[PDB]
Amino acid sequence: MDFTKPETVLNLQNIRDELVRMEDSIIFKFIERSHFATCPSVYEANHPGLEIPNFKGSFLDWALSNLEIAHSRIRRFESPDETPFFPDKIQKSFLPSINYPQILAPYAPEVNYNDKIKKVYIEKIIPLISKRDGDDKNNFGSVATRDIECLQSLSRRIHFGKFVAEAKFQSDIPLYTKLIKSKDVEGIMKNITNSAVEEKILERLTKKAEVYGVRITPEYLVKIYKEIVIPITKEVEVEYLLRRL
Amino acid sequence: MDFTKPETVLNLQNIRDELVRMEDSIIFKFIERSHFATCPSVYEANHPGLEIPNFKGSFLDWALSNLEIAHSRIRRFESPDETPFFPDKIQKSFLPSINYPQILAPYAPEVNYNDKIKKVYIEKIIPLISKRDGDDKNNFGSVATRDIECLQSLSRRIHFGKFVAEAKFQSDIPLYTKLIKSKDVEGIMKNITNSAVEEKILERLTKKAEVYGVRITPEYLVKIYKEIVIPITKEVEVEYLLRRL
Numbered sequence A, B: 001m002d003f004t005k006p007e008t009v010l011n012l013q014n015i016r017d018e019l020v021r022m023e024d025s026i027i028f029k030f031i032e033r034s035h036f037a038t039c040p041s042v043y044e045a046n047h048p049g050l051e052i053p054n055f056k057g058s059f060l061d062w063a064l065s066n067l068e069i070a071h072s073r074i075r076r077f078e079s080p081d082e083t084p085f086f087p088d089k090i091q092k093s094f095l096p097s098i099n100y101p102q103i104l105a106p107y108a109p110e111v112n113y114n115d116k117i118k119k120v121y122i123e124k125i126i127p128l129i130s131k132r133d134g135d136d137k138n139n140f141g142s143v144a145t146r147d148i149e150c151l152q153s154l155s156r157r158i159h160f161g162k163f164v165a166e167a168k169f170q171s172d173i174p175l176y177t178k179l180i181k182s183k184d185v186e187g188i189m190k191n192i193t194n195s196a197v198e199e200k201i202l203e204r205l206t207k208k209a210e211v212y213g214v215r216i217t218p219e220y221l222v223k224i225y226k227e228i229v230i231p232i233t234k235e236v237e238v239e240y241l242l243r244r245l
């Protein structure tokens, strides 16, 4: 797959493979973060305790923004692959700009979920995967980096659902146009996902978790994933598809 | 293991576990980088082609330094765990300084291998693990990040050999003092490593590689590791130990 070649992106088996790569990650990112306590202070807004000059926003926010700025000068946020959490602060690169051919529909950028992702990460995911609850002041830096990477993995995967949904639409125009025209959510819902194949994916994902690393059993993790992360993946697909005509 | 508790660091089973975590990584970092071409320009000194203002040094150097500066403000380079590649440019943190009790001998900082690590990475490792040779200009940023992470994993592991060797020395003072006093390298050599246990580690490591991802077979990779990386690990142990009295 290459984002400079539409045909290679819209290819179903290719995306199929890409996801396997971007879904295994989120799982590896979670297993990493699961070695630290909850560290509420790392998220409490306005960074209570850290003397950050006029910064307003959690410690996590400062760190993530700070690291997104550093990562941008090397073209990280120019690929249709990446969507930053702080667009208003990412710098430009001293490397040549790459011509990425249009693949998705124009409105595509309007379909952004970043703020939702971080909200479920911090409120719903963290409490479940932490080693324990409480601030671990000697690891605020380690923990913060972990979140930034778990946020980065959740985003890229979730937002890749526009390509996943665009490839699908185009794989069967006649079918989707009808579903879309009748604003039939559930119709769309059942055609972009096969229970038979989704489960085998999760069965594979569980096996990876165990062999990788790991209080949190492999199967329990895959369910945290299946029940809090998956639903958001599909919200991007149906939103995109509905306004596709 | 906690670097604020000497007893928990010097603990043999703990380090045993830590390595398993820091050795599996290097392997995951290699499998990642193995999806890109060699990109010689990314290493060619003085960055031929990239208009970097008075910078002198490869593109990799600019990137790595740039990202080490960003990672430092969150205490990354204060833990006895991390040793930067560009000490003369890492900033300070706006977070409280952590009191890390002395564990290793005073001369410890003199035993630095960073420049060797990057030299074997770029000249010996890259040519073997790349998908192919040649510049892949549309990925110089992706590739560069991969190296930074493979450099970061190689370092932390290799330099952790001072703790690994200090724990050993202290685990059997009488034994090591004799070996050291006679400047008996091979003696030291055979006592810090058991062929029986080293192989089981590699056997385990191979299994991980396969299940993780993967031209480069799992077993072939583990050998690249065993033959170019391991030797440097032991060079840190014997150097440290020799000047331990």
Ligand SMILES: N[C@@H](Cc1ccc(O)cc1)C(=O)O
Pocket: A138, A139, A140, A141, A142, A143, A145, B071, B074, B075, B076, B077, B078, B079
């Ligand atoms: N664990 C230390 C040092 C550290 C910080 C950030 C890192 O990415 C790595 C290590 C801290 O949290 O202060």
Ligand SMILES: N[C@@H](Cc1ccc(O)cc1)C(=O)O
Pocket: A071, A074, A075, A076, A077, A078, A079, B138, B139, B140, B141, B142, B143, B145
């Ligand atoms: N692959 C693109 C964008 C990119 C850069 C750096 C990254 O960390 C990620 C993506 C590039 O190399 O320019």
